[PDB]
């Protein structure tokens, strides 16, 4: 009942795919679960997969892995959404600059954040 | 580079699928990302999808959503692995009985846990 879904950055065409941005035809002779796994783990197809976190920002925008958010604070910081296996969580990684926050990523702490770009479509936000 | 993968409980055949337990043929006229999303969200196919957490138990067994673990403690408790959207995390939900733990789900806290069953293949562990 939780939404499980992904967006993809196509490294060949420099394009983010959510639904039908791109066309295709997939064919596999395996079950649904094995199919998802095969696709997710085909690195040479040139798609980078990013998972929807299950949280929405200040504006109802769905927050994905690889998103860059700001705390609608008047503050100078930028954060990157990362999944960290070792804490089995999505969390914020500081991109800029004062490295002091950012608490747990949760429904409370994102109530005043905004998605501003992501690490693929917005290199101007990087480093 | 983090492993993203799923297992599925087939509600029609009462069987857990990881790789080739089940056969099939999938066909879609869309891109990889849209394909994964379609499959994940087809409830009427009768697969319940469960995500790999990114953590392994005391024995190197990979921990999934829906797993039932014990703390290799001599303790009486059982926990269920759940994903909670609102904290964008996998966490333990107490199944039995003394409701007092269980800290964050992380590489430290599972170093002494063991996967014992899951909420589908092990109804004897439930409630």
Q: Any idea where the domains of chain A sit in the sequence?
A: 1-53, 54-127
Q: Determined by which method?
A: X-ray
CA-CA distance, A65 to B82, in Å (whole number)?
A: 20
CA distance B64 to B90: 9
Q: Which residue of A has its CA nearest to B83?
A: A2
C-alpha to C-alpha distances, B61 to B54, B69, B116, nearest whole angstrom: 11, 11, 10
Round to whole Å and give the CA distance between B60 and B56: 5
Which of A109, A121, A16, A107 minimizes the C-alpha distance to A70?
Answer: A109
Residues B38/B26, Cβ–Cβ less than 8 Å: no
Place of tokens 């990889």: B32
How deeply is A70 buried, as exposed, middle or buried, from its count of CB atoms within 10 A (0-12, 13-18, 19+)? buried
Judging contacts by C-beta atoms under 8 Å, the chain A residues touching residue B26 are 26-28, 30-32, 35
CA B82, CA B66: separation in Å to the nearest integer? Answer: 6
Contact between B54 and A85 under an 8 Å Cβ cutoff? The reply is yes
What are the structure tokens assigned to A104, written together? Answer: 């747990």
Structure token pair of residue A51: 């998972």
Ramachandran angles phi, psi of B9, nearest 5°: -100, 115
Nearest residue to B3 via CA among A44, A51, A54, A16: A51
Torsion of the alpha carbons at B34, B40, B46 and B48, rounded to the nearest 10: 170
B26: its two tokens: 């999938």
CA of residue A30 relative to chain centroid, distance: 28
DSSP string, A57-112: -TTSPEEETTEEEEETTT---EEEEEEEGGGTEEEEEEEES--------STTTTTT
- Note whether B82 and B90 are within 8 A (CB): yes
> Does the beta-carbon distance from A86 to B30 stay under 8 Å?
no
Burial tier of B118 (Cβ tally within 10 Å: 0-12, 13-18, 19+): buried
Q: Domain spanning B1-53: which superfamily?
A: ctc02137 like domains (3.30.1490.160)
Distance from CA of A72 to the nearest CA of B (A): 20
Which CATH code for domain A54-127?
2.30.30.290
Burial A17-29 (b: 16+ CB within 10 A, else e): bbeeebeeebebe
Model resolution, angstroms: 2.0
Collect all residues of chain B within an 8 Å Cβ-Cβ radius of residue A22.
Answer: 31, 34
* A51 close to B (CB below 8 A): yes
Q: End-to-end CA distance of chain B, in Å?
A: 37
Q: Is B61 exposed, middle or buried (0-12, 13-18, 19+ CB in 10 A)?
A: middle
Cα separation, A28 vs B20, in Å, equals 12
């Amino acid at each position: 009942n939780r939404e499980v879904k992904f967006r993809a950055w196509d490294k060949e065409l420099n394009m983010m795919v959510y639904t039908k941005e791109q066309t295709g035809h997939i064919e596999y002779n395996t079950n649904p679960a094995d199919t998802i796994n095969i696709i997710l783990n085909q690195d040479d197809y040139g798609y980078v997969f990013m998972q929807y976190t299950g949280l929405k920002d200040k504006n109802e925008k769905e927050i994905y892995e690889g998103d860059i958010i700001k705390k609608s604070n008047r503050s100078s910081n930028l954060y990157e959404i990362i999944y960290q296996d070792s804490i089995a969580c999505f969390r914020c990684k500081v991109i800029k600059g004062d490295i002091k926050s950012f608490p747990c990523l949760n429904i409370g702490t994102v109530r005043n954040c905004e998605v501003i770009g992501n690490i693929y479509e917005n290199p101007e936000l990087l480093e």
